[PDB]
From a paper:
We determined the cryo-EM structure of the active Arabidopsis I + III2 supercomplex at 2 Å resolution. Single-particle analysis resulted in a 2.36 Å reconstruction of the entire supercomplex. Apart from high-resolution structures of the polypeptides, our density map of the I + III2 supercomplex contains a total of 94 bound cofactors, lipids and metal ions, including a butyryl/crotonyl-CoA molecule in the γCA module of complex I and ubiquinone/ubiquinol (Q) in the two QO sites of the complex III dimer. Furthermore, we modelled 4,837 water molecules. Complex III2 binds to the inner curved surface of the complex I membrane arm. In the Arabidopsis supercomplex, complexes I and III2 interact at three distinct sites. As seen from the matrix side, the consensus refinement structure as well as the two resolved I + III2 supercomplex conformations include an angle of 65–67° between the complex III dimer and the membrane arm of complex I. In the composite structure of the Arabidopsis I + III2 supercomplex, the plane of the inner mitochondrial membrane is bent by about 8°.
Protein complexes of the mitochondrial respiratory chain assemble into respiratory supercomplexes. Here we present the high-resolution electron cryo-microscopy structure of the Arabidopsis respiratory supercomplex consisting of complex I and a complex III dimer, with a total of 68 protein subunits and numerous bound cofactors. A complex I-ferredoxin, subunit B14.7 and P9, a newly defined subunit of plant complex I, mediate supercomplex formation. We propose that the main role of the plant supercomplex is to stabilize its components in the membrane.
Residue numbers in the entry:
A (entry chain e): 2 to 65
B (entry chain f): 1 to 101
C (entry chain H): 2 to 325
D (entry chain J): 1 to 174
E (entry chain A): 1 to 29, 55 to 119
F (entry chain a): 3 to 60
G (entry chain K): 1 to 100
H (entry chain N): 12 to 499
């Protein structure tokens, strides 16, 4: 969230953070900002990306 | 260094100067500011003297108390003068002097 | 990477030879000041003396006293010797002549210096001898005390340079050697180096005649030799650091084609030799401080002056916008 | 694999910290743990922190511990005790902590299983950030003294407290 | 880049081997002094001072006057502590 | 002129230092084809990795 | 797998500190050492997260936590020293007089 | 640029004054010419002056403390809530200092560094109240904690004081490590440490099935540290030993100010943040445990200090009931309970410090006090009955809200526990009154009369305790104001 990157440029996930914060700054229900929030958290941890790639690896191991 | 004086709670009195310079604030000191300043310094010197008698250092204790009182009283007077110029405190004198110069 | 061990050996072996001959040079210069000859029988002009002494040491039976710290007692000299060796990985001898071009090299040198104390402490404690323990404690306290001033002087150079890279520190002195404007800082650095290497007039472990037993008194054969070799390698390293930080490393004295003819490694070597000669000369010239006096000098003189030089250099460079 | 080696060294050295009968030995093993930690930091690309862990943890803190523990001359009778009767209580507490706390990141940070395909070609390189690279040192120094200077100064206050307390509790002037 | 640290590791391994060879070839043919604690404490404090100096020294060109004065305030606090130690006799070994 | 005896061990030390520089410099040059470059950063490493392709695949 | 491996390293250090508290009932010096081990593990946690998240906040706080660890060890060892000086021993049976 | 620092004028002044006093004390304490005068009382008076000037600067500059809030945002956050919290903290520090002069001169505790450490810890607690980030919160907590560790061991030749310090440092460091671990887990899971960012990330989800175990355990560890700090059961056993073994002025100071600061922190972290029902259940279970254990253990005590320590544990249980029920009235009642408990504790420790001039240790040492000092025995009896919560004394407010929160939230077990523990507490509080008024011991202890400072402080706190419920409107309004300012 801070924006200070470890190599002296804008942090990797800072634009996602700022989109989420700007959404929540005027949407009275946080459920309206769910998509931007999960985009921010996906940028931090890559959970869904790695899960999908592991599904691909799983199917490869099944068909071999 | 990026700076931003903007306060959370807006000023309730006319803003004579949003971010007054140090010397402008000091030159804005009124008689009441000097009274606050002098009272705080005098009380501090008195406390220094009285508390210094038993150890036997009443003079140096007076000096130490006076330094504390000088710094505190100046900070308090500056606080009041700057708050008046910024519109956070009642500032009839500042507004009157501003509408003329 | 297959050729890296060859480079490492080409550093380590000539360094060990250089230490062996630094001992001989110390003896020779000390003798000549004292109107005598020093080693001149074992080999021509005494040039085979170091090999004979090393051979004697390896052929000496080890003692290993019946202590309860059998492992630690032998590992302490290994630790100090390895630490003396590994600082040379980042030392540049000329442009591009360096094993590891560390961007954080200055702090790495500071870390190695800070690690040096453990060999002495462990040797004192493991030897099962109250005299060795007390001497080791005093020596360790002296080294940590002067490390503060060494670090602050490092910071002064860093402020001037703007990079922890030793080669960059050298090349930042192309306009002028840092030892000219910061001459008192260089004097302070040399004295702190004397104290940090337990050298005269700060050589407490050499003060046996003063009822101050050294930390290595229980050592014989090659553990004692390892301590000695590490100490002299550290003397060479401190001379090299003085050369790098203040005398412009491999740079010539004047930016002229006549001086640029001779290689930079020779410039660096000559400056290092000057500083080693000053080490020997100082040992020949003066008596030694007491422990309490040198501790007072470390904390009461060199720390305040080092901090003041940090403040003055930074303030001046910020004021006129001369920062790197 | 390399992280397996360093973690194994850290595990053994830490067990030696907590289980060595002689406290001087505990301090020495502690020093081995900090060396291994510095190795990990070098793997992360944080060379400033890797060096500072040597300078401060080993060069200053461990030296303090060693000076104090060595002059104490602790006899083993004063601190000895059999630990065989703790194996169960350590087993539950360790297991529960193990089952919960070694795997806490697994649901949030799912690992990428390494496949029999060269994913290295999918690494995208942006040269724009490589024109002027910042060291760890200068990235940290860009922030400590300007945008977060208050925390820096509070840390100074903490150190001042340490100095005052050290004097007031232990000083006996000759 | 961390590439330059690999030669340091190989150098350490070789230096260790040289140490073992040299050391192993000859095998073939209750008085607590508080002042040491005090000097340890002082070294710890000024060790952290140098630690905090390093990034500041490399960052002076970017932090400008604000960073300079913030470090000056840091040093002022630590130097007040040093003056306290000096007056109390922590720096006297007699 | 007897004092020249003491200059021989110092000269040997200086030659030793020159060796510790130059021997490691020439071994690196022979192995890599060019002398070591001081200040190898991310950009230089990326340049070398991309140049391997641009050369070998030509 | 990098991030899980870096985290479990720091985690074993933290668990070792906990175990050192549990196993050292007669040795309070080692208890202090175990507390430092936990502090080291937390510091490592901040540094790893800083890299993983590409964020500098973990690094600033790591430096400040090192300062806190230093001050903590200094004051703790002073208190150890004075306790030993009063009792002449570090055994736990001589620091159990406050109770109930 | 200079005007930006109006937001930190109070803190700048107190820090600078503390430095001035440190220099003054060290320069003249070492003076041969002046024959090494004791300076604890001189520095104490000057530091009381400094605290009062800090209070003036802060109270009179209410709007100015919010100036340049964007510039200061990543460092701290000053508002209405922090305003009143910091005023109350400074008032408590001033009272505690005023109670120390007889101890300084009669015991001859000459160390002026005691006052300096108190002032630095006050600086730390001031920064604790305004902390708005996990990093700042941790740093301020650590500064405060290190100052306490040092002052707990100030009687450095005493077995009791050294034992207190050792236990405090070990258990404090352990709890701080646990809290820091929680902070690291939260950062790793959310990429944030600022309280605003944490509020945005955590709100709307709590435990929506896909709950961040990292976030959940970070919260848990932070809560464990907080509960240690407020001496909530089962993280409490440090408190009685430290309270008894420390010098009594230290015990008085620890009994009040850290609670103010850490509850400020707890409100702004949890209440302003979002994991939710789990954490209110944490404080629920710890409140019940604290009430039960405090009541029973206090009933076991034969010594005054230990009795007061266990009493404070029970009362923090009563207070945390308000945090648990998660309503504006809950927060208001928690604040009212802290204010009233603080003024009662100040009264009790003024009496204890007065009696320490004759070395009061046991409850039985109070025998025949109604004969040897009738007005003192009555004053102490009013404090005890207020502690018991007997109306219409001020202490009745906490009992009233304890049952008000249970009956409404549906908590009949909590009401049961409150009834039982209130009766147990009343028994061990009126035991003291019985000792002073009903007993006829063979040997009496005659106590030296207290100094003017403690008599005046006692006189004012005794009028407040007896007469507060005649005019309770300002506290009620100010605490409703504070509860609202947490979210608006
Ligand atoms: C002063 C006092 C003295 C004491 C002291 O200080 C204090 O002295 C100090 C001196 C210190 C030592 C200094 C130095 C090191 C070396 C370091 O070790 C480097 C290891 C790193 C670098 O290794 C490679 O790095 C590059 C490859 O990455 C290589 O580049 C190629 O590849 C490029 C790309 O194609 C091409 O473009 C290039 O052209 C091409 O050349 C490069 O050559 C090579 O170096 C990390 O590598 C690993 O990391 C990988 C990631 O995790 C792991 O991947 C694996 O996991 C993945 C899934 O996660 C799977 O996908 C993978 O399939 C699967 O393999 C895997 O284990 C392994 O690769 C380990 C630490 C240590 C010992 C320090 C210890 C502590 C001290 C003793 C200090 C001590 C305290
Ligand atoms: C007691 C006993 C007695 C006996 C004994 O032991 C002790 O006594 C001991 C005493 C020892 C001697 C001591 C010293 C040397 C000099 C060395 O030779 C110069 C070193 C080589 C490289 O280093 C230079 O170069 C650096 C970079 O410029 C200089 O840096 C500059 O720049 C920096 C940045 O601005 C500034 O910071 C610096 O200030 C600035 O100076 C650096 O200073 C300088 O040293 C000389 O290079 C040349 O060789 C190249 C070959 O490729 C040729 O390249 C050419 O061909 C290429 C291909 O077409 C083209 O691509 C190229 O364009 C094109 O140039 C070309 O001829 C030329 O470059 C040869 C070894 C020897 C004799 C030692 C032998 C062994 C001993 C006799 C020992 C003996 C055993
Ligand atoms: C009086 O002060 C002095 C000392 O301290 C007492 C010395 O140790 C010494 C001498 C110490 C040395 C010569 C150590 C030198 C060691 C080396 C050059 C490295 C090893 C050299 C050798 C000949 C050992 C060879 C070992 C092998 C396994 C052979 C294979 C290679 C002198 C000269 C001295 O003056
Ligand atoms: C109804 C409330 C709920 C129930 C709680 C009751 C709590 C009390 C328990 C009641 C049972 C009996 C209590 C007996 C106490 C009465 C005796 C008493 O307190 O007398 C004191 C009197 O204590 C006081 O001083 C009380 C002062 C309180 C002032 C409150 C009045 C405020 C306005 C009055 C203005 C001044 C006076 C105006 C007229 C001159 C005398 O104290 P000594 O220790 O004996 O001697 C004092 C020393 N000397 C006489 C020399 C000065
Ligand atoms: C409200 C605080 C105002 C400033 C407080 C001054 C701080 C130091 C004064 C402490 C009191 C003091 O000095 O005590 C000495 C003396 O006490 C005093 O005389 C008071 C000193 C000054 C306090 C009052 C003077 C006027 C203060 C007005 C406000 C300023 C010592 O007493 P003794 O040992 O001589 O007792 C013997 C005698 O039998 C007592 O009954
Ligand atoms: C051993 C040495 C001791 C030195 C002690 C003397 C100095 C101590 C520091 C005193 C504070 C500053 C005094 C110097 C006055 C000159 C300040 C000045 O020149 O103004 C500059 C601004 O200077 C400052 O504002 C820095 C003030 C330093 C902070 C000092 C702390 C004061 C109180 C902080 C409150 C936080 C709570 C404290 C926590 C313990 C103008 O800079 P700029 O606005 O043009 O641009 C900013 C910069 O160039 C780009 O980054
Ligand atoms: C302790 C014993 C209590 C003290 C006795 C009662 C105090 C009465 C004195 C005040 C009288 C005159 C006040 C003057 C006044 O209104 O000016 C304001 C000063 O406020 C003030 O002077 C504020 C005083 C606050 C008293 C302490 C409140 C404690 C709250 C309890 C919570 C404790 C729990 C903490 C975790 C600033 O003007 P302003 O009105 O513009 O400023 C706030 C805007 N928002
Ligand atoms: C005698 C008969 C009663 C014995 C105790 C009954 C235990 C069961 C009560 C129970 O269900 O506890 C729930 C949790 O309360 C709790 O707080 C849990 C029980 C109390 C735990 C803390 C106290 C432990 C003991 C402390 C002293 C001993 C220390 C160790 C020796 C109450 O449900 P609820 O009140 O949440 O319902 C809120 C509805 N709106
Ligand atoms: C709300 C319920 C109802 C309350 C009633 C309100 C009425 C207002 C109070 C009126 C006071 C009546 C008496 C006034 C005349 C006495 C003047 C004091 C004389 C004086 O200078 O005292 C000095 C000591 O300071 C002292 O003794 C002063 C310090 C006393 C402590 C109180 C202030 C401490 C700081 C604030 C505490 C706040 C705590 C709340 C959380 C010197 O005395 P000496 O010359 O006899 O020599 C003592 C031996 N050293
Ligand atoms: C944080 C906030 C904490 C502040 C603490 C509040 C004070 C604690 C109360 C303890 C002593 C006060 C005595 C109670 C007053 C008894 C009569 C009540 C009454 O009506 O008196 C009014 C208030 O007097 C007064 O002002 C009472 C005297 C003050 C002492 C004067 O009536 P009014 O008409 O002037 O006021 C408008 C409201 N009736
Ligand atoms: C605030 C920013 C920096 C903070 C840190 C540094 C603060 C500065 C250091 C303060 C330390 C205390 C200094 C005490 C100096 C005492 C001098 C001395 O010996 O005085 C005796 C000396 C001679 O008197 P004797 O003691 O009777 O011989 O001076 C006096 O006693 C003068 C008394 C008259 C002063 C009244 C007016 C005071 C107003 C405030 C100034």
């Amino acid at each position: 969230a801070s924006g200070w990157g470890i190599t002296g440029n804008k942090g990797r996930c800072y634009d996602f953070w700022m989109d989420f914060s700007e959404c929540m700054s005027h949407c009275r229900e946080p459920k309206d900002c769910t998509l931007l929030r999960e985009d921010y958290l996906e940028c931090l941890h890559h959970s869904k990306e790695f899960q999908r790639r592991n599904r691909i690896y799983k199917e490869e191991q099944r068909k071999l | 260094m990026n700076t931003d004086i903007t306060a959370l709670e807006k000023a309730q009195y006319p803003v004579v100067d949003r971010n007054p310079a140090f010397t402008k604030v000091v030159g804005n000191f009124s008689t009441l500011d000097y009274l606050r300043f002098s009272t705080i310094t005098g009380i501090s010197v008195t406390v220094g003297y009285l508390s210094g008698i038993k150890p036997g250092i009443k003079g140096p204790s007076m000096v130490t108390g006076g330094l504390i009182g000088l710094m505190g009283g100046f900070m308090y007077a500056y606080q009041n003068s700057a708050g008046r110029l910024m519109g956070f405190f009642p500032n009839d004198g500042e507004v009157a002097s501003y509408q003329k110069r | 990477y297959i050729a890296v061990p060859a480079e490492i050996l080409g550093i380590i072996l000539p360094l060990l030879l250089g230490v062996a001959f630094l001992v001989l040079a110390e003896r020779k210069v000390m003798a000549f000041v004292q109107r005598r000859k020093g080693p001149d029988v074992v080999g021509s002009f005494g040039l085979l003396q170091p090999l004979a002494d090393g051979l004697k040491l390896i052929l000496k039976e080890p003692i290993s006293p019946s202590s309860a710290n059998f492992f630690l007692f032998r590992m302490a000299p290994v630790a100090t010797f390895m630490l003396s060796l590994v600082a040379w990985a980042v030392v540049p001898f000329d442009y591009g002549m360096v094993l590891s071009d560390l961007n954080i090299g200055l702090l790495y040198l500071f870390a190695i210096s800070s690690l040096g104390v453990y060999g002495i402490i462990i040797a004192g404690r493991s030897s099962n001898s109250k005299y060795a323990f007390l001497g080791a404690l005093r020596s360790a306290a002296q080294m940590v005390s002067y490390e503060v001033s060494i670090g602050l002087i490092l910071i002064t150079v860093l402020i001037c340079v703007g990079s922890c890279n030793l080669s960059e520190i050298v090349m930042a002195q192309k306009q002028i050697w840092f030892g000219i404007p910061l001459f008192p800082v260089l004097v302070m650095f040399f004295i702190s180096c004397l104290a940090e290497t337990n050298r005269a007039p700060f050589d407490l472990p050499e003060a046996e005649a003063e009822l101050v037993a050294g930390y290595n008194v229980e050592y014989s054969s090659m553990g004692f030799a390892l301590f000695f070799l590490g100490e002299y390698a550290n003397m060479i390293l401190m001379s090299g650091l003085c050369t790098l930080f203040f005398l412009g490393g491999w740079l010539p004295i004047l930016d002229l084609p006549i001086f640029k003819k001779i290689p930079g490694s020779i410039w660096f070597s000559i400056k290092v030799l000057f500083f080693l000669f000053l080490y020997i000369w100082v040992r020949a010239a003066f008596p030694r401080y007491r422990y309490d006096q040198l501790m007072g000098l470390g904390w009461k003189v060199f720390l305040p002056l080092s901090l003041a030089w940090v403040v003055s250099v930074s303030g001046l460079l910020v004021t006129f916008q001369w920062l790197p | 694999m390399i992280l397996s080696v360093l973690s194994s060294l850290a595990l053994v050295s830490g067990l030696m910290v907590v289980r060595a009968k002689n406290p001087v030995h505990s301090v020495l093993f502690f020093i081995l743990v900090f060396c291994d930690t510095s190795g990990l930091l070098l793997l992360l690309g944080l060379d400033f922190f890797a060096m500072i862990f040597l300078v401060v943890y080993i060069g200053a803190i461990a030296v303090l511990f060693l000076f104090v523990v060595m002059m104490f001359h602790i006899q083993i009778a004063e601190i000895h005790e059999e630990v065989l009767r703790y194996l169960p209580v350590s087993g539950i507490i360790g297991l529960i902590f193990w089952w919960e706390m070694f795997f806490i990141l697994d649901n949030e940070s799912i690992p990428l299983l390494p496949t029999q395909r060269n994913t290295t070609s999918l690494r995208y390189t942006v040269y724009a950030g490589k024109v002027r690279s910042w060291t760890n040192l200068e990235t940290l120094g860009n922030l400590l003294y300007t945008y977060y200077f208050v925390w820096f100064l509070v840390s100074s206050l903490i150190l001042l407290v340490a100095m005052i307390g050290a004097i007031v509790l232990t000083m006996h002037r000759t | 880049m961390m590439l330059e640290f690999a030669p340091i590791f190989i150098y350490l391994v070789i230096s260790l081997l040289v140490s073992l060879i040299l050391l192993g070839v000859p095998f073939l043919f209750s008085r607590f002094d508080i002042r040491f604690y005090l000097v340890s404490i002082l070294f710890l404090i000024f060790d952290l001072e140098v630690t905090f100096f390093f990034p500041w020294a490399v960052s002076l060109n970017k932090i400008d006057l604000f960073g300079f004065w913030s470090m000056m305030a840091f040093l002022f606090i630590l130097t007040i502590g040093f003056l306290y130690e000096w007056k109390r006799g922590a720096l006297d070994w007699e | 002129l007897v004092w020249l005896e003491a200059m021989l061990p110092l000269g040997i030390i200086g030659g030793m230092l020159c060796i510790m520089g130059n021997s490691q410099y020439y071994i690196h040059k022979a192995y890599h084809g060019r002398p070591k470059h001081i200040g190898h950063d991310e950009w230089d490493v990326a340049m070398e990795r991309r140049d391997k392709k641009v050369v070998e695949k030509a | 797998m990098d991030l899980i491996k870096y985290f479990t390293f720091s985690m074993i250090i933290f668990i070792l500190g906990i175990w050192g508290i549990l196993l050292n009932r007669r040795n309070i010096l080692i208890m202090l050492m175990s507390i430092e081990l936990m502090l080291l593990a937390v510091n490592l946690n901040f540094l790893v997260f800083s890299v993983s998240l590409d964020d500098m906040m973990g690094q600033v706080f790591a430096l400040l936590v090192l300062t806190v660890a230093a001050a903590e060890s200094a004051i703790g060892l002073a208190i150890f020293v004075i306790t030993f000086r009063v009792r002449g021993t570090i055994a736990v049976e001589f620091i159990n007089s406050i109770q109930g | 640029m200079f005007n930006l620092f109006l937001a930190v004028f109070p803190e700048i002044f107190i820090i600078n004054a503390t430095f001035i006093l440190l220099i003054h004390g060290v320069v003249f304490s070492t003076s041969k010419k002046y024959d090494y005068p004791p300076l604890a009382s001189n520095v104490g008076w000057l530091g009381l002056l400094s605290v009062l000037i800090t209070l003036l600067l802060l109270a009179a500059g209410a709007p100015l403390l919010t100036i340049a809030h964007l510039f200061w945002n990543n460092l701290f956050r000053r508002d209405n809530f922090t305003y009143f919290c910091q005023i109350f903290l400074l008032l408590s520090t001033a009272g505690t200092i005023s109670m120390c002069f007889d101890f300084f001169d009669q015991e001859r505790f000459d160390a002026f560094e005691f006052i300096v450490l108190i002032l630095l810890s006050t600086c730390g607690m001031l920064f604790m109240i305004s902390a708005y980030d996990l990093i700042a919160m941790y740093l301020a907590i650590e500064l405060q904690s290190l100052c306490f560790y040092v002052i707990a061991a100030s009687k450095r030749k005493s077995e009791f004081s050294t034992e207190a310090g050792l236990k405090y440092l070990i258990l404090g460091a352990f709890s701080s490590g646990i809290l820091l671990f929680g902070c690291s887990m939260i950062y790793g899971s959310t990429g944030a440490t600022h309280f605003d960012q944490l509020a945005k990330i955590l709100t709307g989800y709590e435990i929506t099935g896909a709950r961040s175990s990292g976030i959940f355990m970070g919260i848990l560890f932070i809560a464990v540290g907080f509960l240690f700090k407020i001496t909530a059961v089962p993280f409490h056993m440090w408190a009685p030993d430290i309270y008894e073994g420390s010098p009594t002025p230290v015990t008085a100071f620890l009994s009040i100010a850290p609670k103010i600061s850490i509850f400020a922190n707890i409100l702004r972290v949890f209440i302003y943040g979002s994991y939710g029902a789990t954490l209110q259940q944490i404080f629920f279970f710890c409140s019940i445990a604290s009430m039960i254990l405090g009541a029973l253990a206090a009933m076991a005590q034969t010594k005054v200090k230990r009795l007061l320590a266990y009493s404070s544990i029970g009362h923090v249980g009563y207070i945390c009931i308000g945090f648990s029920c998660g309503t504006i009235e809950g927060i208001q009642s928690l604040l009212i309970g802290i204010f009233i408990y603080a003024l009662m504790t100040m009264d009790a420790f003024a009496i204890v410090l007065a009696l320490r001039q004759t070395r009061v240790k046991y409850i039985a040492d109070l025998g025949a006090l109604a004969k040897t000092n009738p007005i003192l025995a009555i004053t102490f009896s009013i404090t005890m009955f207020s502690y018991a919560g007997i109306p219409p004394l001020a202490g009745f407010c906490s009992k009233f809200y304890l049952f008000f929160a249970a009956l409404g939230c549906g908590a009949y077990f909590l009401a049961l526990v409150g009834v039982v523990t209130s009766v147990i507490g009343c028994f061990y509080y009126i035991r003291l009154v019985k000792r002073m008024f009903f007993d006829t011991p063979r040997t009496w202890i005659l106590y030296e009369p207290m100094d003017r400072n403690k008599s005046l402080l006692l006189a004012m706190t005794s009028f407040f305790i007896t007469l507060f419920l005649l005019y309770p409107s300002p506290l009620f309004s100010v605490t409703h104001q504070m509860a609202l300012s947490l979210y608006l």
